[PDB]
Amino acid sequence: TRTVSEGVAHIHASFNNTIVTITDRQGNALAWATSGGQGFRGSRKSTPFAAQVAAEVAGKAALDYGLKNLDVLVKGPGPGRESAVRALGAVGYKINSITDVTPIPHNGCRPPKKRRV
Amino acid sequence: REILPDPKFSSQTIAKFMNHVMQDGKKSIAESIVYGALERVQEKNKVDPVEFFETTLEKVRPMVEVKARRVGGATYQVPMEVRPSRRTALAMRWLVDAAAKRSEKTMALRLAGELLDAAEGKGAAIKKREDVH
RNA sequence: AGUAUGGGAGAGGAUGGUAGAAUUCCAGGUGUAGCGGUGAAAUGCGUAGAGAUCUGGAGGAAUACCGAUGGCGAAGGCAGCCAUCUGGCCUAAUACUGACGCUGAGGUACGAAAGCAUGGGGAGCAAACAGGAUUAGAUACCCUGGUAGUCCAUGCCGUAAACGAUGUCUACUAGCCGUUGGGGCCUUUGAGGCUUUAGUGGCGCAGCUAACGCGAUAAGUAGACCGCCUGGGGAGUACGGUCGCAAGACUAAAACUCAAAUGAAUUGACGGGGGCCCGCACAAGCGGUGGAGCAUGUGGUUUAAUUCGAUGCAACGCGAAGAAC
């Protein structure tokens, strides 16, 4: 409805769950998708096979606005980090830049204790 | 282990298909059914079956198979590549059951019917073969 | 052994000022049904509006790379940047006092974390506490909430695997390969190369050791002094005495019991121990059992007996290749 066509994308990839959000350059949300609404409801949501579909269902909803300027921002390591862009490139989205924006803290608070088992 | 081609048509594919239809070593009753189905399908179109059976089987020939590998307690189903011989074996095992699934007078007539149905695409032998699966 | 001179390195210490990132909280914009977690689920949050993103504030801790086989310090200990005070060490010989040195029972100072007292603060983390799981039981390992503390300033406490499990000082005794601060020499011809010290590493000769190993930073050969040990448990415990707000700290036995308690190494075994290998062992394909009926054996009840054996794989179409006499 805006037809701005310069919306960035935020792919937050984690070991537990991944999130895709196509927003505008300013930051207002336009189309977001999660693995929860997919229907796996478990650790299978962390698989890249689910992350690619979660990114595609968001890309198809963002296509209603006519987005073709893709600026990707990835946060957090884990599986499914590469499946998002490999799924978005299959539909034919034009890519402008790919970089790592995962924030590393500079001497923050105390991390939790290491899991023994 | 290599098999000899049939003495009638000099084709090893027909011999391997007979080895897949044959049960309990009854080569005679399998050869009879195969020859009857061939002569029946030759009546719909006067075509030598050695040219048409290959087309019909490649119409249903699969590409990849899905097997499970245990790593951490999950299935993790992924497709894998195999030699074409395994795919022909799968196709033959798919055709030998689709003909029996039908209801007709003799096995030769229903086999010819299922083969003709899978030729044009109305048979279930190609339906059971799925790409995503 | 020490003094003054000109130079060099250093998380050495005390005081004061200052900043980024990150976490949490407080609003604002778009948006919003799932978010969070376990090998699996929930306790928890949210349609008031979940999660994520952007923008402005609030306060607390530390300072990602540099970072090292680093460096400084008597030990504990010391890492963001800047200003002041101050300590120690190294390097070149010039003169100087001329044995002025080492050790050191009592004594004294410093002394990890935790804790105690006094006035504040408290972001995150978290003893004790609550809820949700597994287990026959879970009181704990797991997750979700959370109080002291972790922080600042002033005192008490003097305790740790405060370990290099190796007291301080001095002189001697083959070598090979790196690092740190200096100096000198050779063509600084080039961050070059070679030697002398002061620290910090890895092998190794001889020698020592029961073995493991040490081996110019000795556990080798030698000297001076201090401390400490006389089988194990009892027991660093009772009593006593000193210190202390307390916790407790220091000094420190006896009765009794046993014929053991130890360190290293060898050969096996184990191992949920990291590999390696193989196995119709796991993968794949085909056909059965387990469902029905019958033959056969065994197990249980009964009778006069239902003759006796065989009992996980390795007993059960077994002894028996064949009970109407």
Numbering used by the authors:
A (entry chain k): 12 to 128
B (entry chain g): 10 to 142
Please give sentences taken from the publication describing this entry.
As bacterial ribosomes represent a target for multiple distinct classes of existing antimicrobial agents, we here use single-particle cryo-electron microscopy (cryo-EM) to elucidate five different structural states of the A. baumannii ribosome, including the 70S, 50S, and 30S forms. Bacterial 70S ribosomes consist of two subunits, which are the 50S and 30S. The large 50S subunit, which includes the 23S and 5S rRNAs and binds aminoacyl tRNA (aa-tRNA), catalyzes peptidyl transfer and participates in polypeptide elongation. The small 30S subunit, which includes 16S rRNA, recognizes mRNA, ensures decoding fidelity, and initiates protein synthesis.
